[PDB]
Amino acid sequence: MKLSKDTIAILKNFASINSGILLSQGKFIMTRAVNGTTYAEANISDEIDFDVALYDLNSFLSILSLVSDDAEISMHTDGNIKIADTRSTVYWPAADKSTIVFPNKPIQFPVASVITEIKAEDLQQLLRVSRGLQIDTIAITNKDGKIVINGYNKVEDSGLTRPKYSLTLTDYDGSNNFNFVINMANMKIQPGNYKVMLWGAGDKVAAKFESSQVSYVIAMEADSTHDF
Amino acid sequence: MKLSKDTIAILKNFASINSGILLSQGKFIMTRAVNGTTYAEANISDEIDFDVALYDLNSFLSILSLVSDDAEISMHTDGNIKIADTRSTVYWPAADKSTIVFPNKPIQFPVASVITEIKAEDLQQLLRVSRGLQIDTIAITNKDGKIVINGYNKVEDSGLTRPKYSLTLTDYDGSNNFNFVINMANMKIQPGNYKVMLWGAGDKVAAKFESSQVSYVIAMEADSTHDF
Amino acid sequence: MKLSKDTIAILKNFASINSGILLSQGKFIMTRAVNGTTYAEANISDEIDFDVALYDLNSFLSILSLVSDDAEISMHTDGNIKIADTRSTVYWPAADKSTIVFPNKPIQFPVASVITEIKAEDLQQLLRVSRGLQIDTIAITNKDGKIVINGYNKVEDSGLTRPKYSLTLTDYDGSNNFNFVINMANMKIQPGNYKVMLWGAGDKVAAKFESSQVSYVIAMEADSTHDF
Amino acid sequence: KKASLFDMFDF
């Protein structure tokens, strides 16, 4: 097989949610954090022609920039990975599935309770500015016919009543009410415009960010409140 | 209120002279070093429309780079600062004057003893080299009808006698003899071309660096010597 | 004396093999690592007009970047180094030979047992990779009429039996057999195309890398084997 | 075992 920059890019994001990953034959990839708060799945143009599990995904991708762009990746005679180059050969360890955490099946996000969106430029600012204002958690709530995000520093505002940052998303008229809390540490979303789908069902609250390239499913904190 | 790239730049500089600062309604900003070592002032093109004190002037300035370039800065209803645009809003703490040190009035440099100048290019090398030569104490002096600056490492050279660096300045067609010693630690001057005015009267010695943008007033060390 | 970018480059390399160095009148420079594994020498365009020893070669070269390109370097009245710039002067300490390590005479490499070559691009890939795959040792050898380089991690694979990288060089028209082991830590070669000369005589094994600019002589590990 | 040029050369 081969892996274009695009593919490599997403896997590099994936590498930040989970240091390892299991590649399965197909043109679909997925990964999930070790604590299970974040899941990501994407359809790549490149076709995977063999099943292999990688322990250090980020270090592996790096090794690729040191070789040909068309370089051929395959399963070697000894069971490891062989990266065939013009005048050279690079080998990489195929990991034993037990040393990594991966999904057995992809996630089926239930139908959206509420649907909103965030543009590549607002997400960027929200991430840059959060690190600045000591923000570690956020709340997506309805307010004045709109869906807004409030940044909070749970450290000193564990009740989340003193927002340090506020971003207005989309208009809203629905008859429901809600304050969905998301742990900022789980927001490992690569840049871009995402369709946000929030879902509540009793004590079960989950968020899904979708773009034309990737999709992330994220579990929301218990502080969450909704009348769905 | 809105602060331009140039004004923010000056304030970032003042931030190094003092972490905090008191902003006063006008187009004039000034700061003092907590320990009266260095004093700076400048006139900006942006108009400050409300008096406010900042405890961490530097962090505030970073926060501004994450927002829209026009975003308005205002006094919020709780006594704190509010930075907003059509989409998001950033809040920042307004400081209580007793938590920061600031000048109550600006310094006046009525008389001088000697007047020279240093070009932007030369100043930059003086600092870069001072950084690489561990020079902590420069000394400005007349020499063969010329004003020169000798950089010294006071620690390894108690009496400032073995210069590590040396820069030539304007011609000195004068009588008097002088060796004004400045602590490099107080030269937190931003790049640019400065007009240098050195003043001596008894044990009182002070220097004033002025550019078209800013103006600093520094206290010179007791090691200085002059016959003015 | 003057030092051009080219000369400053080769010296900066030499700085990584030995922090210090001893410049001797002429247009020839050389050095050797303190651990006595690597030897470097090169012919330069600039003529060295005075003998001096540097304790910190790398820091000196960085200070050169802070002054004019035609800056004159010379011995100062106090014995130290004087770097004459346009309007300024920089001084640098002249080291005491006893505080650095240096070669008394250059190395006379013997006629090579085997001769091959490695192109700039392959050399670069070899180095880049090695750091990624943690290749601490490489072994140059003859396989099916060709010279190839096999990279291992001696810590885990003491027998250099399991290769992580493999680069094919030139054809081998000889009829001997050899496995020359070089510790990657000693491969502090600057980029370029090099003529490779491997030599074997009993326990004595050494490699010589030679480009149109510089030449390196490296002692090879005891693991080596050859029938020369 | 220490790879060392001083085991082959005079410098």
Curated annotation (Swiss-Prot), chains A, B, C:
Keywords: DNA replication, Viral DNA replication, Viral transcription
GO MF annotation terms: DNA polymerase processivity factor activity
Any single biological process term in GO: viral transcription
Gene3D superfamilies in the record: 3.70.10.10
InterPro entries: DNA_clamp_sf, DNA_pol_proc_fac, Sliding_clamp_C, Sliding_clamp_T4
Family: Belongs to the Tevenvirinae sliding clamp family.
Subunit structure comment from the entry: Homotrimer. Interacts with the viral DNA polymerase; this interaction constitutes the polymerase holoenzyme. Interacts with the sliding-clamp-loader; this interaction allows the sliding-clamp-loader to open the sliding clamp. Interacts with the viral DNA ligase. Part of the replicase complex that includes the DNA polymerase, the polymerase clamp, the clamp loader complex, the single-stranded DNA binding protein, the primase, the helicase and the helicase assembly factor. Interacts with the viral RNA polymerase (RNAP).
Function: Sliding clamp that encircles the genomic DNA and links the DNA polymerase to the template to control the processivity of DNA synthesis. Responsible for tethering the catalytic subunit of DNA polymerase to DNA during high-speed replication. Interaction with the sliding-clamp-loader opens the sliding clamp so that it can be loaded around the DNA template. During transcription, encircles the DNA and tethers host RNA polymerase (RNAP) to it.
Protein name from the UniProt record: Sliding clamp
Gene: 45
Swiss-Prot record, chain D:
Domain of life: Viruses
Region (Interaction with the polymerase clamp) residue spans: 5-11
Family in the record: Belongs to the DNA polymerase type-B family.
Record note on quaternary structure: Part of the replicase complex that includes the DNA polymerase, the polymerase clamp, the clamp loader complex, the single-stranded DNA binding protein, and the primase/helicase. Interacts with the polymerase clamp; this interaction constitutes the polymerase holoenzyme.
Description of its domains: The N-terminus contains the 3'-5' exonuclease activity. The C-terminus contains the polymerase activity and is involved in binding to the polymerase clamp protein. A beta hairpin structure is necessary for the proofreading function of the polymerase.
Function summary: Replicates the viral genomic DNA. This polymerase possesses two enzymatic activities: DNA synthesis (polymerase) and an exonucleolytic activity that degrades single-stranded DNA in the 3'- to 5'-direction for proofreading purpose.
Protein name: DNA-directed DNA polymerase
Region of the whole protein represented: 893 to 903 of 903
